Amino acid sequence: LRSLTTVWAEHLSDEVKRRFYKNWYKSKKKAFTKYSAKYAQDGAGIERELARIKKYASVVRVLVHTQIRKTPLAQKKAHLAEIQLNGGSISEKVDW
Amino acid sequence: TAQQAPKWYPSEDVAAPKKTRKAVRPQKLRASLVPGTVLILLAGRFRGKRVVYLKHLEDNTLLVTGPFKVNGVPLRRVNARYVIATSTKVSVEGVNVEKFNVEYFAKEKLTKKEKKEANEIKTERVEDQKVVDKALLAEIKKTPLLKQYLSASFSLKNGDKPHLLKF
Amino acid sequence: VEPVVVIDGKGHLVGRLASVVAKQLLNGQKIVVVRAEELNISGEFFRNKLKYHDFLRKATAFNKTRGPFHFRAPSRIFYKALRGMVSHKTARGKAALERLKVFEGIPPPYDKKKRVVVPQALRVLRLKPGRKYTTLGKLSTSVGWKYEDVVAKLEAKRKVSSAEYYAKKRAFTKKVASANATAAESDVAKQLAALGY
Amino acid sequence: ARYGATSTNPAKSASARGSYLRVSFKNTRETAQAINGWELTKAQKYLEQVLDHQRAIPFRRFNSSIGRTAQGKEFGVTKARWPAKSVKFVQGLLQNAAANAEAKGLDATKLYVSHIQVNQAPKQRRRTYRAHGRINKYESSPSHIELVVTEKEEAVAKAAEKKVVRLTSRQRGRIAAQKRIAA
Amino acid sequence: ASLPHPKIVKKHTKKFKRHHSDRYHRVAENWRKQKGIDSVVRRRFRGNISQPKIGYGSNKKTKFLSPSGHKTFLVANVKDLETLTMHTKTYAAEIAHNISAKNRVVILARAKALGIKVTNPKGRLAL
Amino acid sequence: AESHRLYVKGKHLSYQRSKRVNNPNVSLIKIEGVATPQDAQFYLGKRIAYVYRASKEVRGSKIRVMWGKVTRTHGNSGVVRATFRNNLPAKTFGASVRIFLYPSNI
RNA sequence: AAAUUGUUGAAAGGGAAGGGCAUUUGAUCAGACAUGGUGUUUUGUAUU
RNA sequence: AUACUGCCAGCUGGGACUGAGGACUGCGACGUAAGUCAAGGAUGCUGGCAUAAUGGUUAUAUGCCGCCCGUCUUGAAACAC
RNA sequence: CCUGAAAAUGGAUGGCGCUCAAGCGUGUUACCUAUACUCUACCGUCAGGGUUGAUAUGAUGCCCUGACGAGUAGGCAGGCGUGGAGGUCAGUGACGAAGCCUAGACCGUAAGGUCGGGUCGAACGGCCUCUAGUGCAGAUCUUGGUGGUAGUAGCAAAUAUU
RNA sequence: UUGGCGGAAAGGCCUUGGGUGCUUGCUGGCGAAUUGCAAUGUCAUUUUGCGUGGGGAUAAAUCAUUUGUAUACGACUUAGA
Numbered sequence A: 001l002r003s004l005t006t007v008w009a010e011h012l013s014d015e016v017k018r019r020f021y022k023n024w025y026k027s028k029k030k031a032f033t034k035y036s037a038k039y040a041q042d043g044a045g046i047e048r049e050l051a052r053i054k055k056y057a058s059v060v061r062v063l064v065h066t067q068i069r070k071t072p073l074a075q076k077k078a079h080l081a082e083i084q085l086n087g088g089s090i091s092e093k094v095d096w
Numbered sequence B: 001t002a003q004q005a006p007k008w009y010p011s012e013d014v015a016a017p018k019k020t021r022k023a024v025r026p027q028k029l030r031a032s033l034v035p036g037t038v039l040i041l042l043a044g045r046f047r048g049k050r051v052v053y054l055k056h057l058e059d060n061t062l063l064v065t066g067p068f069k070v071n072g073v074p075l076r077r078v079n080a081r082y083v084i085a086t087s088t089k090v091s092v093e094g095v096n097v098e099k100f101n102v103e104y105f106a107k108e109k110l111t112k113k114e115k116k117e118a119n120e121i122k123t124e125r126v127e128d129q130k131v132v133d134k135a136l137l138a139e140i141k142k143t144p145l146l147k148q149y150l151s152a153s154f155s156l157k158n159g160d161k162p163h164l165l166k167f
Numbered sequence C: 001v002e003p004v005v006v007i008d009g010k011g012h013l014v015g016r017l018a019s020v021v022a023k024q025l026l027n028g029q030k031i032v033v034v035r036a037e038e039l040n041i042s043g044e045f046f047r048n049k050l051k052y053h054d055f056l057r058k059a060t061a062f063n064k065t066r067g068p069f070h071f072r073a074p075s076r077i078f079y080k081a082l083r084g085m086v087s088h089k090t091a092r093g094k095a096a097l098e099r100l101k102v103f104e105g106i107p108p109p110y111d112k113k114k115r116v117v118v119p120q121a122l123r124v125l126r127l128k129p130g131r132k133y134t135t136l137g138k139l140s141t142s143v144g145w146k147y148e149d150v151v152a153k154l155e156a157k158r159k160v161s162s163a164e165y166y167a168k169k170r171a172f173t174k175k176v177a178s179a180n181a182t183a184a185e186s187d188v189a190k191q192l193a194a195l196g197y
Numbered sequence D: 001a002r003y004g005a006t007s008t009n010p011a012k013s014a015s016a017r018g019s020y021l022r023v024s025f026k027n028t029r030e031t032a033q034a035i036n037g038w039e040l041t042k043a044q045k046y047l048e049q050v051l052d053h054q055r056a057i058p059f060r061r062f063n064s065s066i067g068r069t070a071q072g073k074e075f076g077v078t079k080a081r082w083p084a085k086s087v088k089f090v091q092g093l094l095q096n097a098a099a100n101a102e103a104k105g106l107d108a109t110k111l112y113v114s115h116i117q118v119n120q121a122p123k124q125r126r127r128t129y130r131a132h133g134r135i136n137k138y139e140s141s142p143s144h145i146e147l148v149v150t151e152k153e154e155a156v157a158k159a160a161e162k163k164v165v166r167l168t169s170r171q172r173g174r175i176a177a178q179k180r181i182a183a
Numbered sequence E: 001a002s003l004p005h006p007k008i009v010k011k012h013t014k015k016f017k018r019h020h021s022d023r024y025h026r027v028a029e030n031w032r033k034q035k036g037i038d039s040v041v042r043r044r045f046r047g048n049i050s051q052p053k054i055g056y057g058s059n060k061k062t063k064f065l066s067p068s069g070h071k072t073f074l075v076a077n078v079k080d081l082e083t084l085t086m087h088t089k090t091y092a093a094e095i096a097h098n099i100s101a102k103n104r105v106v107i108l109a110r111a112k113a114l115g116i117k118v119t120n121p122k123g124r125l126a127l
Numbered sequence F: 001a002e003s004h005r006l007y008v009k010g011k012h013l014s015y016q017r018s019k020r021v022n023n024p025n026v027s028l029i030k031i032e033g034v035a036t037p038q039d040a041q042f043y044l045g046k047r048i049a050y051v052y053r054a055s056k057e058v059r060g061s062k063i064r065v066m067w068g069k070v071t072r073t074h075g076n077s078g079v080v081r082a083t084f085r086n087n088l089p090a091k092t093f094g095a096s097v098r099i100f101l102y103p104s105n106i
Numbered sequence G: 001a002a003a004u005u006g007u008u009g010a011a012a013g014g015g016a017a018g019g020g021c022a023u024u025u026g027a028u029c030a031g032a033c034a035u036g037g038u039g040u041u042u043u044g045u046a047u048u
Numbered sequence H: 001a002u003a004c005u006g007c008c009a010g011c012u013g014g015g016a017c018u019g020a021g022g023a024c025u026g027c028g029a030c031g032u033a034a035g036u037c038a039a040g041g042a043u044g045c046u047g048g049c050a051u052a053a054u055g056g057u058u059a060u061a062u063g064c065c066g067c068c069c070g071u072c073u074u075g076a077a078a079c080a081c
Numbered sequence I: 001c002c003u004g005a006a007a008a009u010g011g012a013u014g015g016c017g018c019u020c021a022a023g024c025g026u027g028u029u030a031c032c033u034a035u036a037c038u039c040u041a042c043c044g045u046c047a048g049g050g051u052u053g054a055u056a057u058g059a060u061g062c063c064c065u066g067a068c069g070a071g072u073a074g075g076c077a078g079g080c081g082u083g084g085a086g087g088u089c090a091g092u093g094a095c096g097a098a099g100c101c102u103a104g105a106c107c108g109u110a111a112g113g114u115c116g117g118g119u120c121g122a123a124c125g126g127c128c129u130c131u132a133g134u135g136c137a138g139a140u141c142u143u144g145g146u147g148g149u150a151g152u153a154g155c156a157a158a159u160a161u162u
Numbered sequence J: 001u002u003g004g005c006g007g008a009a010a011g012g013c014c015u016u017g018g019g020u021g022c023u024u025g026c027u028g029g030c031g032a033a034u035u036g037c038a039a040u041g042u043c044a045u046u047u048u049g050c051g052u053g054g055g056g057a058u059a060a061a062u063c064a065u066u067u068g069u070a071u072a073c074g075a076c077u078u079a080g081a
Helices: A014-020 A033-038 A047-055 A090-095 B123-140 B146-151 C014-027 C045-056 C074-085 C091-098 C136-143 C148-183 C187-195 D025-035 D040-051 D070-075 D084-104 D169-181 E101-114
Strands: A061-065 A080-084 B037-041 B050-056 B061-065 B076-079 B083-089 C004-008 C030-034 C040-042 C100-102 C133-135 D013-021 D111-120 D125-130 D134-139 D143-151 E071-075 E091-095 F008-017 F022-031 F047-053 F063-074 F079-084 F096-099
Touching: A014 A061, A047 A090, B037 B061, B050 B123, B050 B146, B061 B123, B123 B146, C004 C014, C014 C030, C014 C040, C014 C074, C014 C091, C040 C136, C045 C133, C045 C136, C074 C100, C074 C136, C091 C100, C133 C136, C136 C148, D013 D084, D025 D040, D025 D084, D025 D111, D025 D143, D040 D084, D040 D111, D084 D111, D084 D143, E091 E101, F022 F063, F022 F096, F047 F079
Parallel strands: C004 C030, C030 C100, E071 E091
Antiparallel strands: A061 A080, B037 B050, B037 B083, B050 B061, B061 B076, C040 C133, D013 D143, D111 D143, D125 D134, F008 F022, F008 F096, F022 F079, F047 F063, F047 F096, F063 F079
8 A cells, every 4th residue: 555645634733743843832832834825715625635645545544633532641642544445446445 | 357358259240031931911800891871989099980981991990980970980090909890780881982092081291290289171081971971871871770870879777697688 | 588587487487497496597697487376296185395494404403593494485595496506606697597587476567578488397398298297376375475375366466467468558559450451452552572571 | 383274374284292191092083073164153152062072972983882872963973982082182272273263373263273183192001900900001091283274265276287189180170161151 | 229039918817815904904915815714715716816827828929028128126226227238228326215315316317318118208207 | 981890880799708607707799781701800809999988077078988800700691709908797698899900901 | 223103295995904917096206308410591600 | 514532832811929130251043244133130111299298206096816924844824822 | 205204503406596497317419618739929948050251349248940838845057145354346335335215216036236315524435256144924932112901900907077 | 728538556548639850752962081901999888976057845853841641771652842
């Protein structure tokens, strides 16, 4: 299996965005800013990538992250991982 | 001192050579090389070009011409080992060739002090080229496609096998 | 000769083809071998499976990660044959092996290019009719290669596209054949026939 | 006088030297190679940071069976140390060389340590007592330290050789033909 | 300017270096015959250093002849050119390393007067 | 024209050698399109060039040449023996050489 | 002086290094002048 | 007739390596006297360069090969010293 | 060909690999290459021989011909190098001797010899002879010096310092 | 310039309409020489550097401090305008 592309969400929580940093406090928090700029339009780079994932990509996995602000740990850095979707067709998985 | 002397001394005069027993005899050209044969040059500035062969000079070289009018090769001498004699022949009758010789191809060697770091044709030579090439084109024009043949150069294409190619 | 020679690995016997292409690599030919799963081996399938299990039994006792690395893909089986036939521990052998590229199926760089055959390695010509033989894909999948089916479906896709291209080429060639038949029977065609073309 | 092989000019250079320095030659070599080629003021700041354990001398040659430290990360190595004594000796010599450069009238802001070198001084010997009534050596490895600071300048090489060229008659004819053809 | 002799052929321009002179510093490079019982060099196994043999000897006609064709001859004063005088096409002078600069200049002048070629007409003189 | 080659392509195969000793003084050349000694006999006594490139120009060119010639046929399969003025550098085992058509007999 | 070492410079380095034969590549280097002078179009006119 | 075998002091080609010697002498061959010759060892004509171009030394790369020497021993790279 | 046919690290027709073979038996040719054979060049050794005559010349010379060349232990020969001695070069040298450094040159098959460059500062060399405390990689050699190991083992008994 | 198709490593393959050059499909005119009888007789570069201009957006990581889900030392997991 080879990853074709990863489509992301318009707004990323600061908890998950903290995962992409090793020194988050001393940073400009520039993370997914240009991706969100690519967002706010219908399908300039989003619906087309999802159509690519539907046309190809026999396996689709959803990227998720944990709500560790809710969890009582001192972490504040969301664990983000991949969970495979195992039902329906590729189109159904992608639009799910 | 540092070195006293040698024990004995040999002779000192230049040695005369023995009477060499090698006589120069005229070269026997390969049978394909008859005057009027169309040759293709294999090396030099005019490599691959198709010329006609006029006369075998006395210094074992062959007199060729393009003619200059068709392909731009002037009256030159070439080595018989750097040409390919072809089947096609043009009758070189009606052209005078007895004028050309090594004396005709004098060079006037450049000086040793003339080192070209930053540093033409005689009218008589251009006139002989013109007259010979006129009398030669007068013959070449008769058979079709030969002027085009001589103008076009020769080269090996992919898949050409010289050991199978009949020139 | 050519810059790259691409060999359709189907129907070739592994050893004969490996000797051919090893000599070609040493002589300086760049060789790419596609369709390595359709590459044959003489002998019964069970016999060749026993040979591979005998190979699989060999590994450094004190550390199995230093011992022979038994590759399972058909392209890697053919590559191991070739590397045995090349003097791989010298710089020249390393260069000759770098000139080689083996594949299962026909990847995109080479599915659009001519594929040749080495007839002195071909099973139909070499083997006696009725003599048993194995297939490298079946052997590989039996000994632990996990991409037999995906390669099969990609191969079917490639077959379909190639057959469409071939039908188009046939139609165009037929139209050109009709055109040259009509424009033919001319002085030029007659003189070319008299000249040998 | 008579330092090591230097490629600079004494007009824009100052020197310092210290011989028979009872400091470890190996730790001193590592410290010298650490500050080698640096700006003088930057190297002085680095040496005081090493004394404060904020940074380390990377041990590159004499480092067998020494420990690992995150402070080696900035130098690309894993084995770095904090040789207080050799650092103090080296920065004493650095201040001496800066004094000499000021005396000679050198800008002192673009001074950089162009040359630094430490080799083995004659050893100082003592006795150590082993089991079963044996004597072994207990020897210091003093250092000869020397250094040269000089002013930074621009690229020092230009105006290459004439590069005379010799062509044959064929090559000269080809060049002339190409020149006549080209427009 | 000089007689055309037979071509100067050197059968072995490589130096015969003593075995293991590369391996050990105590073993000097000057050739020594290996006389060990098991020595691969003495036994002439394939792949080992070549041993000096009389078959490498130089042509009698070109022996002791330098590249120019002159045999080299040490001189220490103007007097020795006086036995080299009439043999300029077969003999070359060579000033001893011990000659002072003034005597070296005087020997050079004498050789230049006599047409004698000297093998080091560059020592102790500037550009 | 688009094709300008006046020579024949060949490849420098190896030195003359036994199982475990080689002779750098004679190299083996494979002529393209020849597979028989009767075919190679045509190229017998023909000049060969190894043309290579160096990054430093010397005599106005960055291209250097080693000249040699085809001496005799080798083996049963159209390989020939060739001898060059300087032996080929053994990194060219499999490098292309040019077999010219001179000296000519046709 | 050597072993041994520092610095600088050059080069190589996939479980040693070193060596022989051969070439290539880089660096480095020796070796033929103008010497008698039939030509003399030339200075301190027998001084090239 | 051809095949096969033998012979030819039969003919005609293609390619490679070598050029030792340095006045004459000898054995010859062809010629008609005289001369000439492939006959007791290469000459003729031509070109480029005349300088690191050829070459030497050196370091590296490459192809092949190369076990650590001394010793005692029938036998040593030796897990013999 | 198969069964008889069982051994211990993983494993060896040398390896890959080979099945109308790249296996087995036989036959026919072509081809590859040893320091062997043939033919040349050159080196040395051995043998057989030529060579009187006068200036400018050595007949311990010059030249012709042929054959041959493996070697431990061992024998002999011809040479190279070192300290000192007789003779000689009316030798080199403070205007730089000796020594030492130098992937600079030349010569000799080699032992080695000569020279260029740097350092140095008071002696030294060529040739004919004489002489010996005369040539080193080894001897668990002798004396001195220096390494890798290695900034390593370690500097932890006797309560404990701030 | 348009419409496409190709995810196996697609990184390529088609296609619409225009600008422009050549055309040896068939006939002409001029030029070529002298590189001297050959010398590869220099014609291709996922290189790099230094320059010019047509655009384009203006971060992190490490050390240090800290954590203990970790830890011999590194490393790991945290936090910190």
